[PDB]
Structures are given as structure tokens and as C-alpha cells.
Amino acid sequence: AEFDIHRSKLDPSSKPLAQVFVSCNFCGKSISYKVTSCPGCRKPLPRCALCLINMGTPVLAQFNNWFTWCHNCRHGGHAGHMLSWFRDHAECPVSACTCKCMQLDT
């Protein structure tokens, strides 16, 4: 990673590309962001599975306010909450979900 940082600093042409894009499942329009609601359909961001709080709302340990997402179960939530839940359990906390998102990678 440090070598890549140095190379990017010296060489701007070797910049990597984006990996994740935002697309609404209702409006079907690609969204570039941040943004509070869907520009087209005004639909909000997904909520945390344990705190039921919409993404992007505020509230060292600052990393805990990120959104962990599982592309297998398509569920996610606050980093701290999800990590604490998975520390003792081994299933997606959403009801009727069986993906073992944390234990899957190893």
C-alpha cells in the first residue's frame, strides 16, 4: 500500500478505478455522490439492521460510524454494532437470513 501511495504521488497516470457504484432498485438510475435521498424517487438509504437508523446520519473509534455491507445477504449496518453482534453469533442478524457474512471469508 505504501509503495502504491508513492507511485501514485509520483505518477498520476497510474490512478486506480472506482469499484462500487450506487444504483436505485426502484428508479433504476445510477447515482453519483453525500446525498441524503434518491434524486429521482426520494427513497432513503437502507437502515442499520440493529439500530434502525438511516445511513449517513451522524452518531480513534471514528471508524465505527461506517456501513458494513454483505453482498451475499445484501444486508448491512453500523460497523460497531455489526461487529459486536458477530463476535458472539454467526448469522445475519436480520430475520429469515442465514448468510454467515463474517465467517464466510476466513
Binding site: 478505478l17 472506482a18 469499484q19 462500487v20 457504484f21 450506487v22 444504483s23 436505485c24 432498485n25 426502484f26 447515482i31 434518491c38 424517487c41 427513497k43 432513503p44 438509504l45 437502507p46 437502515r47 455491507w69 453482498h71 445484501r74 436480520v94 430475520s95 429469515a96
Partner: peptide
């Protein structure tokens, strides 16, 4: 329950 109807994430 029902799935979230709204913003979703795709990957290149």
C-alpha cells in the same frame, strides 16, 4: 419482512 426498496450498491 420485506426487503429495502431504495438505494442499492453495485460493483464494477
Amino acid at each position: 419482512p420485506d426487503p429495502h426498496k431504495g438505494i442499492e450498491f453495485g460493483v464494477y
